[PDB]
Design a binder for this molecule. Structure first.
Ligand SMILES: [Zn+2]
Length: 832
DNA sequence: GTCAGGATACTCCTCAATCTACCGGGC
DNA sequence: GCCCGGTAGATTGAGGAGTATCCTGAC
């Protein structure tokens, strides 16, 4: 009962056709639930007939208590290992298990289910005690090394020359194991031994980079290509050696390097691609194929499909970009027209690993998922726009009804669970452990959903199931604390780190368990905890930082980086930049604090000296979340850009007084000089007579010039900006205090007086005008603001309250403005 | 019958930036 | 009781390893 396609596929081995038909009923009885695909996969190998006959003969005894091999495991071994591996396993059933080797059946299957399984199994059985005792190697490492094609040679090479690489090259056994855990490990190890001094001395390459390069499939060829092409790539093409080793640290890096060398000028001249884009595209598996596909299909996708080159690069910037590009070219118009999905969604689906599988699954499953199960196409694209989208989508298709009618979960919860990397694992773990968690430990379904909705939720859920009782009982933590700890990316590592490190971090450095939970409740909390352990005494005795400050610095996503950056940059910022350590702690106690600290170090002198900004303003700007982009944007706008943009950016920092007095009329020149003097004195800075003469010359020589008095003391001068209020952007309100004499004093909403913080109008322009009149004894003046909502309903009373006795004020809202509510007023009103 | 190399596909772990919904004192 | 600000979460994107499976050439 085989189809034509199955017979054609199995006809690769001519002798397998006869044996399968004669005894077709025989394997079914011996191998229950054996699907035709498994049979055709087993029988299509070099010894399909022999392997099938051996399985049929031996499966009666291969299911014994010493092995207890499942049917799927037997089929996999027959397909991969062959007749030799099956015979070796059967002949040594009692040798592998129940022996000083101490090998589980899963490890035995993994070693056997590989090319040359018999030789690898014999080598393991002969050399496991030797490598365990003489070299002190973990049996897991030996199994991992031997679980590869030609693993016997790699194991023998490791046993032969582990001490040589350990001593004469200073390489840890872990690096050797990682290098030898790939195909052709013996050749890679020999190449490393013969080449490490040459690549480390003449080429000046870090041994870690060489180890990383050699820790891939075919590392010997990659190392040889690197040695042969490093000077050429560094000189002719101007490629950084770090970039070269990053490109060559993938599977088949030799082909990628050759393609890059052969096609860099072509893509950089006849295609417009930058070297960085080509490097990024080539920094993935199958780089040669991706580069060739990009070069061949760039005009086709750019013109016929209307795709920007950046989108093509991003699609090809992943593993297997050739298949994704071909699938996009084949399936863009038919899927877009017949389903109406935006091309951005199609790009987002294929912008990950295995995008072709996700795209095909979406094309197949959109109608049925949207019809029977009721998912929105946006939800489907959200689930498919992740690593392994095919697995998550097929799992949703298979599993949604039983999850939504038996376990009492909503479809949106399932959509959230399945919309993460490895969503199939999370879905299956939920289906397997939801009753257990909701019964044995009392966790609510919402907590389980929250735990399972991160990258690697299966490991987090299993870790919770294993470690929740012991953490909750021995360590005295409420289950809510463990749920909070585990509900993060890579939460298994954080949970194991907490279980390991709670007693020492409590009884050694005197940290409250709540502090440990706060440190560990963020992504990458294991690194934060280890860094706190290693650094806390250093920050205590060597710099006088309290443990509370260390915990506050570490209680963020980038806690390790922030702590290391604080340790490295505390003396320089505290001595050569004039920053108090408290300001450093405040800057670092934010998400991405390492970048903020480095940006402060880099841009403090240029901002403080060239543009005349106080260090306090820089610290305040950098003390907010995401302060690095804010500082970079401020530097960009201050160094170049529009005059009005620079003026607004400078005034928005606060403490800056601008003036647009006009004409000569020496009297108001004197008054303006007096006002500048008063502001400088209020800032504690003496402006001296030379700057008085300078500003007087500027005022007398530039008609209609607007000044700016920063808190530092520098007087920025702008030639011309505008004589009218700017457009209202919805959050920033601008005002000008026009006196009777003629002086115009600019104002901007926000950054109000801290003294009246409890007052709700703190920051409005009318309040700033009132305080300015009160301080400088201004009798009468008017205001003009460009708020389109009119004056606020609080200001009409509060600003009149702040006015001095006997003082007058006027505010004029714009004519085009309309009041938004009864509180607001959209007409001229005189206050007193 | 093995050994070495290349190509996809998938999972998990750490980081940095931005968005928003709950709380809270004043009206 | 009803806000609008503050801010502590809560997405959202990104990169970097680590893991697993399959196909091909050469003896
Ligand atoms: Zn106001």
């Amino acid at each position: 009962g085989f189809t034509h396609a199955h017979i054609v596929a199995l006809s690769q081995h001519p002798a397998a056709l006869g044996t399968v038909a004669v005894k077709y009923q025989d394997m079914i009885a011996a191998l229950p639930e054996a699907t035709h695909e498994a049979i055709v996969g087993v029988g299509k190998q070099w010894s399909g007939a022999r392997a099938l006959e051996a399985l049929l003969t031996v499966a009666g005894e291969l299911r014994g208590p010493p092995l207890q091999l499942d049917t799927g495991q037997l089929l996999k071994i027959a397909k991969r290992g062959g007749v030799t591996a099956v015979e070796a396993v059967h002949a040594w059933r009692n040798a592998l298990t129940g022996a000083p080797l101490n090998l589980t059946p899963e490890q035995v299957v993994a070693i056997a289910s590989h090319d040359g399984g018999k030789q690898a199994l014999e080598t393991v059985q002969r050399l496991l005690p030797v490598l365990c005792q003489a070299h002190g190697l973990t049996p897991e490492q030996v199994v991992a090394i031997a679980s590869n094609i030609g693993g016997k040679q790699a194991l023998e090479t490791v046993q032969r020359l582990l001490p040589v690489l350990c001593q004469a090259h200073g390489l840890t056994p872990e690096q050797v194991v990682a290098i030898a855990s790939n195909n052709g490990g013996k050749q890679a190890l020999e190449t490393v031994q013969r080449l490490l001094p040459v690549l480390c001395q003449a080429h000046g390459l870090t041994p870690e980079q060489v180890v990383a390069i050699a820790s891939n499939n075919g590392g010997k060829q990659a190392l040889e290509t690197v040695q042969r092409l490093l000077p050429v790539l560094c000189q002719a093409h101007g490629l950084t050696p770090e970039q070269v080793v990053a490109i060559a640290s993938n599977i088949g890096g030799k082909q990628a390097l050759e393609t890059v060398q052969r096609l860099l000028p072509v893509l950089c001249q006849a295609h417009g691609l930058t070297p960085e884009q080509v490097v990024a595209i080539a920094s993935n598996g199958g780089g040669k194929q991706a580069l060739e596909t990009v070069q061949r299909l760039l005009p086709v996708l750019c013109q016929a499909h209307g795709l920007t080159p950046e989108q093509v690069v991003a699609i090809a910037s992943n593993i297997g970009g050739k298949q994704a590009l071909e699938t996009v070219q084949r399936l863009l118009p038919v899927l877009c027209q017949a389903h109406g999905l935006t091309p951005e969604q199609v790009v987002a689906i294929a912008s990950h690993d295995g995008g072709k599988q996700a795209l095909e699954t979406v094309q197949r499953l959109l109608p049925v998922l949207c019809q029977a199960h009721g998912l929105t196409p946006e939800q489907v694209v959200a689930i498919a726009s992740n690593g392994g989208g095919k697995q998550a989508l097929e799992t949703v298709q298979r599993l949604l009804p039983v999850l939504c009618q038996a376990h009492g979960l909503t479809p949106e919860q399932v959509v959230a669970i399945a919309s993460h990397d490895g969503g199939k694992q999370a879905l299956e773990t939920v289906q397997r452990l939801l009753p257990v968690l909701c019964q044995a430990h009392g966790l609510t379904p919402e907590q389980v959903v929250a735990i399972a909705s991160h990258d690697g939720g299966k490991q987090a859920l299993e870790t919770v199931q294993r470690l929740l009782p012991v953490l909750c009982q021995a360590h005295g933590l409420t289950p809510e604390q463990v749920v909070a700890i585990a509900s993060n990316g890579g939460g298994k590592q954080a949970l194991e780190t907490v279980q390991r490190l709670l007693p020492v971090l409590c009884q050694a450095h005197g940290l409250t368990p709540e502090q440990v939970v706060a440190i560990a409740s963020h992504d990458g909390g294991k690194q934060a905890l280890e860094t706190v352990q290693r650094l806390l005494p250093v920050l205590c005795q060597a710099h006088g930082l309290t443990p509370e400050q260390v915990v506050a610095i570490a209680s963020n996503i980038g806690g390790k980086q922030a702590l290391e950056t604080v340790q490295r940059l505390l003396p320089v910022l505290c001595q050569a930049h004039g920053l108090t350590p408290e300001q450093v702690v405040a800057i670092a106690s934010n998400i991405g604090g390492k970048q903020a600290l480095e940006t402060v170090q880099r841009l403090l002198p240029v901002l403080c000296q060239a543009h005349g900004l106080t260090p306090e303003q820089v610290v305040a700007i950098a003390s907010n979340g995401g302060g690095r982009p804010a500082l970079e944007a401020l530097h960009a706008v201050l160094t170049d850009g529009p005059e009005e943009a620079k003026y607004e950016a400078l005034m928005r920092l606060g403490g800056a007084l601008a003036i647009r007095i006009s004409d000569n009329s020496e009297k108001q020149i004197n008054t303006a000089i007096n006002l500048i003097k008063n502001h400088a004195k209020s800032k504690g800075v003496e402006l001296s007579e030379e700057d008085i003469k300078k500003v007087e010359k500027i005022l007398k020589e530039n008609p209609g010039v607007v000044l700016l008095l920063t808190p530092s003391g520098k007087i920025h001068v702008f030639p011309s900006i505008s004589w009218s209020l700017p457009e209202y952007d919805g959050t920033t309100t601008h005002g000008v205090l026009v006196l009777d004499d003629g002086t115009q004093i600019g104002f901007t909403s926000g950054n109000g007086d801290p003294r009246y913080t409890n007052y709700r109008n703190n920051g409005h322009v009318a309040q700033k005008s009132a305080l300015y009149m009160r301080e400088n004894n201004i009798s009468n003046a008017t205001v003009y603001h460009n708020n389109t909502n009119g004056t606020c309903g609080y200001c009409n009373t509060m600003t009149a309250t702040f006015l001095p006795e006997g003082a007058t004020l006027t505010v004029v809202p714009p004519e085009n403005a309309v009041a938004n509510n009864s509180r607001a007023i959209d007409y001229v009103k005189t206050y007193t």
